[PDB]
Design a protein around this ligand. Structure first.
Ligand SMILES: Cn1c(C2CCOCC2)nc2sc(N3CCC[C@@H]3C(=O)NCc3ccccc3)nc2c1=O
Ligand SMILES: Cn1c(C2CCOCC2)nc2sc(N3CCC[C@@H]3C(=O)NCc3ccccc3)nc2c1=O
Ligand SMILES: [Cl-]
Lengths: 428, 428
């Protein structure tokens, strides 16, 4: 256990955030009798709200019902970090799946803390705003999620690009990048050593490539040596195609240097906007205070829908669900790889996605696929995504295409790649 | 119509935000045939989601039903600014209620644009982050909403306090404050003239005081003369106790200098996290791009619940609803004023709230009510909120108490003020 200095990863603005007056009140109300008349809060009267009951049908589960009182709770303000029954369910899930070393650490030493967020990306945006001053160095691997790049761009950090391949980030690249600094330079803020490494360790959007166990051990040792955070943005953790899931950065986080984002967006609902951050208490605390002044909390309604489903499923029923979803996406993956093999062998290069929704295709011989897709393929009713958007320099030419296998039938994929092959052939 | 320079109210970070790759795609898909096979998106497959149908009962309205297809939409990603049917409903509401002069202006000249936000406060936090560099001057009236003060604190602006009274902000105070600068200094950023005036013009949290029509005309002329924005945070617009609602700043916004936040939190649901910003297109556009990288959008589910209710109600059914809510809060107001009259006449000063949920009570003779409330009243099962939290300098003594009349019965209020009166009497 290396002694962390979280002040180093919190901006002056972030550190200036004071606690809610609401929490001061609720703590006074606890040190005091339950038979209480409080006119001190700012809750509106929930009996004025026009939604009264809710019945919601479910796969392989008892129907979810909001009675009159539960509905009034669902329509009312709730805690910033999330409703307690969901938070505690999720805390038990994280202990079962990742058994983080930080569980029983003291708060100031990076004790594991959770925060339910309005989607996992709200969590990360908050994390990036917490950490980054202009001119700070951050590490990631291009191709990278376009949302992350669009989020980091206005913050004025320098993105130092780490090499990646079929197995995610190449730690051998990271090591060479870091040799620029001496390990002692982490103790000196004028030397400007990397604040963090961001990655999507399973099923990277857009590549489909997942890190291996061994590479995560190497990355963690480098993060320990040069004393940076690892931001583990892991929305396809529950869409891994291999039988045994790869150990997370969180699971090996002896130092309390890992902030993890989990997403319900591909397994439970994207539209509900319920994800969660898991990380060291001092950093999670900063994120929570920012949420207090922006969204206040994620939808109470949508949390109670998800929490009731998860409590009646149990961990067993939840993991049975993710297994059915993995099976679906694994068949879709096999279908798109078949269409790839049939139409693009000799015209394009690609790897087998280890997780997620995307096949990432390099077109041989064509420097920029943007003209082929946007001017020709579109007019023929086919579209894949040019790779341009997944690099910091998006105006640079890209031969790559991101192709989602989430929705399309085998009949549609076949047509799509036949058209692509035809267009590649008439462009060379 | 004064020609605005919105660049003046956008930070370098905010201006650096580029458009979504998602919007580039959707625009390509429009310039192209409808019979389309797109593997270019990142939507997960919504048939994997475990919620299948929803039935939700309603006051004075046909039950809301999500069929299988509508549920899949409700659980899926949706536009950043909000779902189109809600946005267009809300745009028509704003035209009926406020008839803003900016409706038919060109986009660059401050054309009225709406954004559905995850609560109205998300909108404002985004607005504050968009505008404020450290050392910028901003205008507001203390006592001010604690959330606003906690949000502005880490941004490092100077809050210049404008006087307020029974009728909100005193424009005569504002005028004297602004005479510090010459009107020409708005054209020179080194002179550091106020970026904006923030206020809650109806039923201020915590005071209950609402601006008059005449005072809004004076404030607007001052905002025109010294060329600042008016941020109209108006969550109690639909909780006004007088018959005729006071014209909004938005309604008089000839220049496109008004950003308005409306809230559904006291009339429809606080817990659902659905509010909206109305403002000039260049500023709303910046807020939307920030939402794109944080929450992505407000819950699609909760938007469709609200939109279906609002479409079946019509504007008539909605305004009939707000009228019933106003009636409820007006009776609650009358009840708390009766308890005030009975127990506190000669012990405390207060005004009749013009709107909202709060009575604001000045205790005579006691410098700091914090000790009386937190050490004595609590142990006797009564609590009101010390006023400390509603000033920039919160450690300064406050004789004021915010007392909500949203929930408590007349029996409870009577006990609360009898206890308060007893405690005031034994403190002098
Ligand atoms: C008890 N409570 C809760 C608890 C709901 C259960 O989960 C834990 C939080 N939440 C909220 S949000 C909220 N707001 C936001 C709109 C404006 C209104 C509000 O006046 N704020 C300021 C405030 C200052 C001091 C004390 C009290 C309030 N007030 C409350 C509130 O009073
Ligand atoms: C069509 N569409 C919509 C539309 C839903 C209807 O309302 C208007 C928006 N929304 C979203 S959100 C989303 N995300 C977020 C998680 C990651 C995933 C995603 O890969 N982003 C990146 C992206 C880049 C370029 C093109 C496409 C996607 N993808 C979509 C999406 O593809
Ligand atoms: Cl946010």
């Amino acid at each position: 256990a290396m002694e962390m200095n979280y002040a180093r990863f919190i901006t002056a603005a972030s550190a200036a955030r004071n606690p809610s007056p609401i929490r001061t009140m609720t703590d006074i109300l606890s040190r005091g009798p339950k038979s209480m008349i409080s006119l001190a809060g700012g809750l509106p009267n929930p009996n004025m709200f026009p939604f009264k009951t809710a019945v919601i049908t479910v796969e392989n589960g008892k129907t979810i019902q909001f009675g009159e009182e539960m509905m009034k709770r669902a329509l009312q303000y709730s805690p910033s970090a999330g409703i307690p029954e969901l938070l505690s369910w999720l805390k038990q899930l994280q202990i079962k799946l990742h058994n983080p070393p930080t569980i029983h650490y003291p708060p100031s030493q990076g004790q594991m803390d959770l925060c339910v967020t309005s989607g996992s990306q709200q969590g990360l945006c908050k994390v990036f705003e917490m950490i980054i001053n202009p001119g700070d160095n951050v590490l990631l691997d291009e191709p990278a999620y376009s949302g992350t790049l669009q989020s980091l761009h206005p913050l004025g950090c320098n993105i130092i690009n780490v090499a990646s391949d079929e197995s995610g980030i190449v730690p051998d690249s990271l090591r060479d990048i870091l040799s620029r600094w001496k390990p002692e330079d982490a103790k000196n803020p004028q030397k400007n050593t990397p604040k963090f490494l961001y990655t999507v360790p399973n099923g990277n959007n857009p590549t489909g490539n997942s890190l291996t166990s061994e590479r995560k051990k190497e990355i963690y040792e480098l993060a320990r040596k040069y004393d940076f955070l690892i931001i583990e943005d892991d929305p396809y953790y529950f869409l891994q195609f291999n039988k045994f899931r790869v150990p997370t950065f969180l699971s090996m986080d002896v130092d309390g240097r890992v902030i993890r984002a989990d997403s319900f967006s591909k397994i439970i609902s994207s539209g509900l906007r319920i994800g969660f951050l898991t990380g060291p208490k001092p950093l999670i605390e900063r994120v929570i205070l920012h949420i207090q002044v922006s969204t206040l909390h994620p939808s109470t309604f949508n949390q109670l829908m998800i929490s009731q489903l998860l409590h009646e499923w149990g961990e067993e029923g939840f993991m049975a669900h993710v297994d059915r979803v993995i099976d679906f996406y694994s068949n879709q993956k096999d279908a798109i790889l078949a269409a790839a093999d049939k139409w693009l062998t000799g015209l394009a290069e690609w790897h087998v996605p280890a997780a997620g929704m995307f096949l990432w295709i390099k077109v041989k011989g064509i420097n920029d696929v943007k003209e082929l897709i946007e001017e020709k393929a579109v007019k023929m009713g086919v579209l894949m995504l040019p790779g341009n958007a997944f690099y910091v320099d998006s105006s640079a030419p890209s031969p790559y295409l991101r192709a989602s296998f989430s929705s399309a039938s085998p009949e549609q994929m076949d047509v799509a790649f036949q058209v692509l092959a035809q267009l590649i052939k008439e462009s060379l």
